Amino acid sequence: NGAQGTKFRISLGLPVGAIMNCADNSGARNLYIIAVKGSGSRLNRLPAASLGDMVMATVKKGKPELRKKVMPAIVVRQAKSWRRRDGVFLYFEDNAGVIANPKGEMKGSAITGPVGKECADLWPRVASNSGVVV
Amino acid sequence: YHETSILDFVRTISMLDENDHEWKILKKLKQTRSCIEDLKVLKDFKMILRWRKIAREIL
Amino acid sequence: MRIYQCHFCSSPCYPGHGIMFVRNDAKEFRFCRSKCHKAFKQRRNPRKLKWTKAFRKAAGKELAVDSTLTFAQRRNVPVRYNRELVATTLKAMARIEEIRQKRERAFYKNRMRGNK
Amino acid sequence: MQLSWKDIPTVAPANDLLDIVLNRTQRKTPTVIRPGFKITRIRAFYMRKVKYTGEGFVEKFEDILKGFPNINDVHPFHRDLMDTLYEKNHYKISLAAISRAKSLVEQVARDYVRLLKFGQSLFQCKQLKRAALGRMATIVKKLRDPLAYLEQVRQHIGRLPSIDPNTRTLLICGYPNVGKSSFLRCITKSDVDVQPYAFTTKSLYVGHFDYKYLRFQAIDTPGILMNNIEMQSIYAIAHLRSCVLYFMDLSEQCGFTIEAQVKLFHSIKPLFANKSVMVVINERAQLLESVKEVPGVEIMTSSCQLEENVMEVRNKACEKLLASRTPFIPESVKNLKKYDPEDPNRRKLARDIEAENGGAGVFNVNLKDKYLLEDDEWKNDIMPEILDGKNVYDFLDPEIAAKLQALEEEEEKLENEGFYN
Amino acid sequence: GHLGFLPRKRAASIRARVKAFPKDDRSKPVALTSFLGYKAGMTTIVRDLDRPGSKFHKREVVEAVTVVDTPPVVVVGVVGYVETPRGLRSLTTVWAEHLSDEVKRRFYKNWYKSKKKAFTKYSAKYAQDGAGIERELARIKKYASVVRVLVHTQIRKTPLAQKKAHLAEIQLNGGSISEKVDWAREHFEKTVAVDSVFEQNEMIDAIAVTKGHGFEQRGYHSRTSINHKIYRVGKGDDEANGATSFDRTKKTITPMGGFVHYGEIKNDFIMVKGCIPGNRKRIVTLRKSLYTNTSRKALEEVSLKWIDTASKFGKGRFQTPAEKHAFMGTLKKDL
Amino acid sequence: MATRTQFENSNEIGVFSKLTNTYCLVAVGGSENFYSAFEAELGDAIPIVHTTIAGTRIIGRMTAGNRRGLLVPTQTTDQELQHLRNSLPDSVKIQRVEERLSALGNVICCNDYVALVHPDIDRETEELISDVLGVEVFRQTISGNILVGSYCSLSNQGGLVHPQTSVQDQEELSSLLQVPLVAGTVNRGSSVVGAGMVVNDYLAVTGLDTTAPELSVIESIFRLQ
RNA sequence: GAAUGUUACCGCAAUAGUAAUUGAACUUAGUACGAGAGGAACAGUUCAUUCGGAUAAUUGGUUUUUGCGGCUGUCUGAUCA
RNA sequence: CUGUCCCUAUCUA
């Protein structure tokens, strides 16, 4: 659910334990990555997420309601240089993500800041709640 | 995104229209416009601070 | 395909070459090579580097404005793509490039003449 | 769950369950040891095998207990429905038998593991392990009858209907053999023939239908005249929030006289009086006045052999249950005919063209010949868009001839003055 | 690791001889099954992707394609192979009576000190009233069940300084082995165009020795890469070979200032997506898929949009000197 | 009146396509069943154009416009703009917009007479929208919702607002536009009304999961029948 | 690395090993099935995880290019260096 | 905050 195509192996720069700003008006400040769903288990490799990936994260900062809980999160910014199909390499300002249910429905009424094109084209609901795509 | 009128920087440090007569007068000075509005892209803040001090002295 | 203009150096940026940066203002910074990207990371002013095209334009070492440069205006209004229009535009582009070369040479000669 | 317990795992008989557990114990765990091995090693090996067998038995028993719904702890309607088909006390005793078997297996495993560690020889350890396995088999063997009963009730419960008492619903009641299921056939997707013999339906039938966009479904019942088939209908009538329709045969069919049917309806009235009842009649008609003594019951004179009044009854049952700047439209759209899917002559859509060309993974939609142009001769656009490293799109524009002429005039006016030399 | 690639020892020679050849359809017209060449750097290509189903359908995609220098190949002889219980056996061989200085040098290790008597005796007997060459041709036509053609590369037409050609055998896939030798006879001392053996969008599999790495022994081993599509085939005399139907700029595919560790492309070349085993200046042989691997990716054509030909040494902002001059303008040393 | 379909086993009909009273836009894909359904519903009555925006299939959200003109974001390539011009009649203006809020479909909710835009949108973009599209523009937020385009669908016959719209907000929007507005849901209770369906003066396309009461409400609010 | 007239070139193959792996996106699918709830599959195409062989076409990393330019310090009486 | 690590690569004597 939520996905709209097959994964594209973009550069990974968000291994487990990373922290990223919550780019939504849901009230959460940051998201702590605990695991990367859909990733491969390599020998000693830390599961690494990327733009457009769905991962499980816990709200380490924000209102107490979201604290200590775990919910699926979608990465909207990676900040790591990766090769887009349109020739030029690009990287975002900083790491960011959003919190949504496994069905792709965003908890926040609207997303803030730039949104990766790959994630927008793979998560239609994210693009629906996005205002600045790239 | 953060957007503020640097024209009003005279009344301000925390940060770092030609119709108004005040900006027209401030433009007549040998300073200035080239990169004042490019704060994020700019040590050049010293020039902006000097321009602000000059404007305060004039006004 | 687009031969973009580097934000810092203003040089053409062919596909693949260079790197890109994304700002919260939705604008994209294109750098033709790692040198320009590293210079921008240090927040150096492009108008204060002797080798940047912006400095040369501001410094007057090269023609800042010319009639031939108006043809390169970014047109956001598309056209019906008439083949005759395409051929005329190609010929005009070639002639304008020749005229721009001639005018740049004349400007350089004017700036150079006087070294007695 | 609560609707249909089709997810219950199969209850393997005592012989099958024991065989599966023993095969799992023999396969997964190791079985190679020697008398010369360390005594502690042999003790640990035997204890591990016994513990694995006990854990497998416990897991099987726990899965059986969890999958099976506790009749007492289920919705009263479903509870009584299960009680009518399966004796509630017998089912509870059967479940308690499985629980007792699991407890005995756990106790045996713990006691033997406690005793097994003290074995002073390989033979003693082997004998203790064999005794534990025999105890487990005997405990499982005694459960043959309850295990078979559990398997039968599991295989029978899966096909039971997913009745939803909370939702607004209508119940088809009446005497048996009155074609009560014919109304069901013509009002919903259900499929049960007239079958002129009375007790065709040994179980309730349910069918869904929609009225005024609100969800509805109808439940069929064998009928009433003290047996399981008849008993289950009583609880369905009582507990369900559905309205109940009474079917009567105004003919020699079913042999029962009109007086007998009316008397039976009156006798069962104290049970469905609050259900917003309706009567459908599938000096003779004079007795209908006595039936009408109940304010809430109507008299739908009809015959279930056709759709003479099923259409009106469908709406009546639902009604009773509920009682309880200007726009711009291009002329082309209004003139274009609708795409009739069944007509072979309908306009060929992109789907037909793709099918005639090949699969979806080999046919590529061509945008050429679709977009408009001044001249269709050059529809095969090959726009270069690049010239000596220059973006043509930044120069493409009409009336550029005047600009070129002005530039030429400027060049002429600059050359005659000797600007270049 | 990969036990299938063991032993990871040094290759027998720089020229990795082809172990297997594609199927032999004895009814098809006579044609070559392999071609020689030399790797010449690499370049980036951006093109549209006509591939239904893929999300990037009707979209431009950047890709890297290698460039191999393939000067016209010249045939100097043929080999007849008979079938025996111990495998194929070469019963006899023939030559054209004329051998270029390159192959003559290939037969000598100290050329300048050699007397250069490579084929004087054989050539003298070749000029008789036949009965020496026709006999061998008839013997091949009679007993041989498969025929291979001997050819060599025109190193003297290559910007490399090796000055020595490499002999290589190529299997003939077409007509009966009598038609094979009949066609070969008409090609003795002749040259075969590169575009005759391959065409655009055709898939090929390369075979060459990879870069050596010394002790770790690593590298310098023979390797085969399959399913490589040909994006464009050009000619040395075809000016503007790098000019796509869209770019239409009169610039050669040779990068500004020449290739890195390689000269300039002034002969026929083959452009194939992806990399190839070996490095620049390494001799590479090209096969065609070893079988009918005509998948949709192979079937679909690649309409080139732009070809990168900037200065590969260091960096590059322009594709031709004219662009650099126009952008930079006149300079002090210009006038 | 309305139609229920799904694009590539997806319920976000409006995300992957845009519908107007004179033209329609759809994404590019091997499974053209979406295009087949559009042709069945419209056929040759109005042009159907396949066009990606910056290579995205969410053109329905990246671009916004009306029957009088079309707007595309900066990320749109020149080739895409040329294809749009060729495939679109000259009667409909095409104008690239340079703004931070590139999500025109989510930032701009526009009909043939009036349009709503994100208040943060700069004055120049608002003036360009008013001129090219020839429609009045007012900065507004539906019951505090910032993404008016995604959470609001507007048409000359009516408009659908997100379910959490306050009654006062509904009345204010109805007075501003003068067309009746009633809160509702699409895609079986989906809060993103503007993404799951598209609607023009005569045609409405919604997700297959939309319930019959939802379809009836959509038809009634838009006065289809 | 000598060896079987010598020297060089092109070859066959007994033999030893061997490799690819699994998943998901869409016409087929809202079709069969099914009262509903839900919901297949073949053939086709397009991607993906791990593993392995190669390349640096673009990008990241690396500088006894020391290649350039600047900076704290001292010496050639100083500046050029 | 760091190459301890995901994941290693490069330079010097």
Side-chain angles (χ1 to χ4, degrees), chain C residues 1-2 4 24-26 28 74-81, chain F residues 74 78-79 81-82 85-86 88-90 94-96 98 100:
Chain C
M1 308 184 286
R2 278 289 302 189
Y4 273 97
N24 267 255
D25 206 347
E28 48 269 51
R74 182 183 172 78
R75 285 167 188 81
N76 287 351
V77 284
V79 189
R80 186 45 59 88
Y81 175 64
Chain F
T74 311
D78 291 337
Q79 297 91 46
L81 200 76
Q82 184 62 64
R85 180 67 280 157
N86 301 359
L88 201 71
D90 305 315
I94 293 161
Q95 182 65 78
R96 197 183 275 148
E98 273 72 356
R100 170 171 58 253

Side-chain angles (χ1 to χ4, degrees), chain D residues 161-162 188-190 206-208 215 351 360-362:
Chain D
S162 57
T188 171
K189 185 59 170 294
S190 316
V206 173
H208 270 262
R215 190 64 169 173
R351 181 184 185 78
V362 70

Side-chain angles (χ1 to χ4, degrees), chain A residues 3-9 39-42 45 81 83 89:
Chain A
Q4 202 69 77
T6 55
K7 177 193 167 207
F8 176 44
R9 191 187 179 73
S39 64
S41 302
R42 224 204 300 285
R45 164 153 275 225
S81 55
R83 192 184 67 74
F89 288 63

Side-chain angles (χ1 to χ4, degrees), chain E residues 14-15 32 34-39 68-77 95 99-107 149-160 162-170 190-192 194 198 262 267-268 270 281-286:
Chain E
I14 284 82
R15 180 177 54 73
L32 261 74
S34 66
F35 212 79
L36 273 63
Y38 302 89
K39 207 192 181 191
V68 65
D69 186 15
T70 48
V73 158
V74 48
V75 175
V76 294
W95 303 97
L99 289 158
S100 174
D101 194 49
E102 309 151 295
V103 285
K104 288 161 63 167
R105 203 171 287 106
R106 169 60 63 172
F107 286 108
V149 69
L150 282 157
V151 316
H152 78 91
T153 38
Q154 293 189 328
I155 198 82
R156 62 112 162 77
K157 220 173 171 64
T158 316
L160 301 179
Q162 186 163 18
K163 259 177 174 70
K164 188 174 278 186
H166 307 68
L167 273 296
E169 286 179 346
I170 299 95
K190 304 294 186 174
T191 175
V192 178
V194 188
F198 321 99
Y262 183 72
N267 310 104
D268 308 355
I270 315 179
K281 309 196 284 189
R282 193 83 104 203
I283 189 162
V284 286
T285 305
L286 283 83

Side-chain angles (χ1 to χ4, degrees), chain D residues 227-356:
Chain D
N227 52 64
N228 301 90
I229 296 161
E230 193 177 75
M231 196 81 193
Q232 80 194 346
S233 68
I234 300 162
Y235 291 122
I237 297 153
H239 294 57
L240 296 176
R241 196 242 294 278
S242 161
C243 71
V244 69
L245 275 69
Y246 195 79
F247 276 52
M248 299 164 64
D249 219 327
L250 191 69
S251 190
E252 183 147 32
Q253 287 142 311
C254 191
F256 278 100
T257 65
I258 276 60
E259 278 69 39
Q261 298 176 53
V262 169
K263 280 196 290 190
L264 188 276
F265 156 80
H266 283 301
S267 79
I268 313 293
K269 186 237 69 170
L271 182 132
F272 52 66
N274 307 101
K275 308 291 123 186
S276 200
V277 180
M278 184 177 286
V279 184
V280 178
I281 307 100
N282 189 351
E283 192 271 335
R284 200 77 159 194
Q286 184 175 331
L287 195 68
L288 296 177
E289 296 163 28
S290 85
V291 178
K292 271 196 82 70
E293 287 290 321
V294 184
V297 306
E298 296 83 355
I299 38 161
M300 276 63 182
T301 52
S302 41
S303 188
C304 299
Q305 281 80 30
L306 68 164
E307 59 265 27
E308 35 71 34
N309 289 296
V310 65
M311 197 75 154
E312 313 313 316
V313 172
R314 183 178 74 261
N315 317 139
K316 281 156 164 50
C318 296
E319 171 51 30
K320 169 149 276 193
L321 274 159
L322 293 171
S324 301
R325 50 188 148 288
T326 55
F328 172 81
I329 304 99
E331 57 264 24
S332 197
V333 178
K334 310 196 292 182
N335 300 349
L336 183 60
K337 56 131 68 178
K338 201 192 84 181
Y339 168 81
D340 191 17
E342 57 246 46
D343 186 11
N345 306 268
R346 70 200 186 286
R347 53 166 168 279
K348 288 210 298 188
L349 312 181
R351 181 184 185 78
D352 304 320
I353 293 156
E354 176 259 25
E356 290 153 24

Side-chain angles (χ1 to χ4, degrees), chain B residues 34-48:
Chain B
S34 60
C35 302
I36 292 174
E37 282 277 2
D38 303 334
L39 303 176
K40 293 107 178 183
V41 179
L42 315 192
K43 287 173 190 170
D44 296 357
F45 297 133
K46 295 186 179 184
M47 312 311 284
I48 308 185

Side-chain angles (χ1 to χ4, degrees), chain B residues 1-54:
Chain B
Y1 190 62
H2 286 293
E3 300 189 67
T4 66
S5 172
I6 289 156
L7 202 153
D8 294 283
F9 194 55
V10 176
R11 286 93 210 190
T12 61
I13 311 99
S14 58
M15 279 291 295
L16 319 184
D17 182 21
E18 285 181 54
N19 187 269
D20 292 350
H21 54 271
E22 297 173 68
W23 176 226
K24 282 201 176 197
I25 291 155
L26 293 170
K27 181 258 196 85
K28 228 72 160 61
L29 314 181
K30 59 174 281 182
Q31 294 82 21
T32 82
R33 284 179 294 130
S34 60
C35 302
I36 292 174
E37 282 277 2
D38 303 334
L39 303 176
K40 293 107 178 183
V41 179
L42 315 192
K43 287 173 190 170
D44 296 357
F45 297 133
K46 295 186 179 184
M47 312 311 284
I48 308 185
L49 291 164
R50 283 151 186 166
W51 171 87
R52 188 193 58 75
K53 289 177 184 187
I54 291 156

